[PDB]
Structures are given as structure tokens and as C-alpha cells.
């Protein structure tokens, strides 16, 4: 089968920069009757892949005219001439010339922006849970950048790491953030036992992390 | 424009099969297209599954061999997937997507449709309100948010206000442990307009036919 291998694996670019993005093929993909079956596709965060450039050169239906295609025989190169935000996801290559047909293995574009701390807010388990058994608090470190982050948890000022389950959003493109999620599970006969209960992000906006703590059963 | 769309079961137990439909508007699938069914799967890899073109010629992936059957109903403008043998490698998200014969071009695809292959059981969620303590409710803004706890298979569905609250919300990919998966989301407004202005999260569960909305009460009288 066809070896579609695209380079770089991620790229950052800031906005108006342009961007440009390789695939090389391992078979050469023009065909019979001079047509290139070479697509290049984006998909956005929780879309489907869409169309951008087909027939090697060509910019499909609807899309962008920033979007260019370029290259012959093994390799192609997708240029953006000045990215948006809106841009931001991972683009594939794809070849219809010689079956079964293959996707390159991704690029994703990020976006670069200014540093940004995140807001953090922390919630105590509802008294619906409580009435069941498990106890969960939840803490969110929302919109900053870069990406990376740490969160700790405290329980009575003592460190926490078991029962921690933390999730990640993709990159906003309406601020190009991050956002993370942190869930501390407890039973709620263990979460009854104890006062006071903290998140602490750690982010490389501040030196000192970001504390958010509550009390049970104070407001 | 040709708009396509995947629906048929999300679970399946291992070593039945999955039964996936495409049902094309805006054109008529006996013309001009390959019909093509391709898969997702965590960490952004495509598979090429194979196709059915619009006088009903098929074309499938050697790496499905005897498991594929790519179909059409031409009275319904529907095509099908049939993928038997199914083992836990086949979890995916499955897209239908149309690219013209001719040259490749117009490409469109479905939204896509989780298929789990699991032996766990469905298991209805529990939608539970996170409401800002005190101390943080006194800034220009103020963050809520909800739980979505204990269900299975994905998805869910989850939307503020009906919907009518878009902006300034975050929902966090689910985590799966034990065969449960547990959701979150926030959604952060100007603090003056709260509690004025109620906020609600809306779920709903297809697999479970169960929706909860669930209003979020401030912390303290209500």
C-alpha cells in the first residue's frame, strides 16, 4: 500500500503568518490520464475531516482561495498564505491513484498567541451525588496558554493524587486557549470526614500556583 | 448541495456485526459519486474502508477482507455498511463521505457515528449541578458547570439554556473507567446575571433514551 507521510507532525504558527505543510508519497500518484488523485483535508475539533485542495492543485468546492496546493509525482505541499485562527486542526493528505486508498498520518496546526493564566474555579460535590455514595470535586483551568499545566490536590492541606481524572480541550479558535478539567473522586462517606478541600494550578504566567479552596459545608 | 448522513447502532458485542446506514439528500446517489464509508480511530488515523460508486460498483479495503459489505438502497438514496466479526480494534468513529468519480473533487461527509464494540452494559447518566461556591461569585464573572457521571457507551448530548447559551462554555472530552464514563462542562457569564437569569444543563443519553435538565442552584437560599 501507499506510504502517505506527512511533515512536520505540528506546527504553530501566529496569526497572519504563513504556514506550509508537507506529503510525500511512497508511489507516485499521477495517473493515466494526467489527472493527480491528491486530496488535502482539515478537520477542525469535533468535526468531520472537510475539503480543501483535490486534484493535486486544484482548490475544492467553497474553499478558501488561501489555501494552496502544490507539487507533482511524490511530493506535495499545502501552503496557507496567512492563517486564522479558524484554521487551526489537523490537516491530512489522502491518494485516490493506487488502491486501496491512503491518508497521511496528520498535521496539526496550532496557533500561537500571547501568554495567558488561567481562571480557575473549584466545585464542591453536589448534594445529589451526595445522597449516593460517591462524592466527586471538580476544578477548572479555563482559557490559558500555552497548553501546559498542573494541577494538585489538597484535602485538608495534604496532597491528593489518587482518584484524580483530568481532561483536555482542544485549542479554542475563538481565542486560541486551552482549557483542562480535574475531577477528584472520593466516597462521600470520605469527602463527609473531611473540611477543607483545594486546586492548585500551576502555569508558567505566574510563579506561585493559582489556589482555589472551599470548606464543606460553608457556603 | 449533497448532504450525507450516518446513523444504526452505536454498541455492539463483540464478534456480531455493525450495521451502519448513509442516507444521501440533495443528490441522487445513482449519479456522479463514490459513495465511500471511512473510519476513524483515536490519534487521528484514517482508514479507507471502500466504496460503492453510483452504478453500484464496490471497491474495499484488502485490510477488511470477508468481513466488509458495502450496499445501496436506491429507492431510499441510502447506502450501507455491514462489518462482521467485529472485535474491540473496530471501536471508530464511521464516517459515510461522497467524492466525485471524475476527479476526486466535492468531497462530503457525514458527521460521523461512534461504533463501541463492548460487551459493557448501557447505563444510564447522572447529571449533577456544579454550583460556584460564595467566595466566587463576588468577581465580574462567575463559572457553573455540570457533571455528567456514570454512563455508557458515548455519546451524550449536552447544551446550556436549550442552546441559547453558546458562548463562553467549555465541554471536556468524557474519561472511561470501568466501563463508565463520566463528562464535564462549564460555562462562565457576566455575574450580575445570576441567579437572575437562570442557567440549565441539558443532557440527553440516546442509547439510554433519558434526557435530564437540570437547573443550577446558587449554594445557600434559594
Known amino acids: 500500500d501507499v506510504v502517505m507521510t506527512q511533515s512536520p507532525k505540528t506546527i504553530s504558527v501566529t496569526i497572519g503568518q504563513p504556514a506550509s505543510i508537507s506529503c510525500k508519497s511512497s508511489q507516485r500518484l499521477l495517473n493515466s490520464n494526467g489527472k493527480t488523485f491528491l486530496n488535502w483535508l482539515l478537520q477542525r475539533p469535533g468535526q468531520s475531516p472537510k475539503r480543501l485542495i483535490y486534484?493535486?492543485?486544484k482548490l475544492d468546492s467553497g474553499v478558501p482561495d488561501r489555501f494552496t496546493g502544490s507539487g507533482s509525482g511524490t511530493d506535495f505541499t499545502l501552503k496557507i498564505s496567512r492563517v486564522e485562527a479558524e484554521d487551526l486542526g489537523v490537516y491530512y493528505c489522502w491518494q485516490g491513484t493506487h488502491f486501496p486508498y491512503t491518508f497521511g498520518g496528520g498535521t496539526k496546526l496550532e496557533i500561537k498567541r500571547a501568554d495567558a493564566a488561567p481562571t480557575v474555579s473549584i466545585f464542591p460535590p453536589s448534594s445529589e451525588q451526595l445522597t449516593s455514595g460517591g462524592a466527586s470535586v471538580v476544578c477548572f483551568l479555563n482559557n490559558f496558554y500555552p497548553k501546559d499545566i498542573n494541577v494538585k490536590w489538597k484535602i485538608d492541606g495534604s496532597e491528593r493524587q489518587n482518584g484524580v481524572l483530568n481532561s483536555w480541550t482542544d485549542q479554542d479558535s475563538k481565542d486560541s486557549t486551552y482549557s483542562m478539567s480535574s475531577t477528584l473522586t472520593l466516597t462521600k462517606d470520605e469527602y463527609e470526614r473531611h473540611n477543607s478541600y483545594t486546586c492548585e494550578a500551576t502555569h508558567k504566567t505566574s510563579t506561585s500556583p493559582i489556589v482555589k479552596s472551599f470548606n464543606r459545608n460553608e457556603c | 448541495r449533497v448532504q450525507l448522513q450516518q446513523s444504526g447502532p452505536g454498541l455492539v458485542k463483540p464478534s456480531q456485526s455493525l450495521s451502519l446506514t448513509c442516507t444521501v439528500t440533495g443528490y441522487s446517489i445513482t449519479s456522479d459519486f463514490a459513495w465511500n464509508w471511512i473510519r476513524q480511530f483515536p490519534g487521528n488515523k484514517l482508514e479507507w474502508m471502500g466504496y460503492?460508486?453510483?452504478?453500484?460498483?464496490?471497491s474495499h479495503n484488502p485490510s477488511l477482507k470477508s468481513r466488509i459489505s458495502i450496499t445501496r438502497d436506491t429507492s431510499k438514496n441510502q447506502f450501507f455498511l455491514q462489518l462482521n466479526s467485529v472485535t474491540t480494534e473496530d471501536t471508530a468513529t464511521y464516517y459515510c463521505?461522497?467524492?466525485?468519480?471524475?476527479?476526486?473533487?466535492?468531497?462530503?461527509w457525514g458527521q460521523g457515528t461512534l461504533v463501541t464494540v463492548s460487551a459493557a452494559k448501557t447505563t444510564a447518566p447522572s447529571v449533577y449541578p456544579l454550583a460556584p461556591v460564595c467566595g466566587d461569585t463576588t468577581g465580574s464573572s462567575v463559572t457553573l458547570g455540570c457533571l455528567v457521571k456514570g454512563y455508557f457507551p458515548e455519546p451524550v448530548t449536552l447544551t446550556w439554556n436549550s442552546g441559547s447559551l453558546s458562548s463562553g462554555v467549555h465541554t471536556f472530552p468524557a474519561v472511561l473507567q470501568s466501563d463508565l464514563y463520566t463528562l464535564s462542562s462549564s460555562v462562565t457569564v457576566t455575574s450580575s446575571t445570576w441567579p437572575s437569569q437562570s442557567i440549565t444543563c441539558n443532557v440527553a443519553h440516546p442509547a439510554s433514551s433519558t434526557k435530564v435538565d437540570k437547573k443550577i442552584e446558587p449554594r445557600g437560599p434559594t
Open positions: 486534484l493535486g492543485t
Open positions: 460503492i460508486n453510483y452504478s453500484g460498483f464496490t
Open positions: 463521505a461522497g467524492l466525485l468519480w471524475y476527479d476526486g473533487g466535492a468531497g462530503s
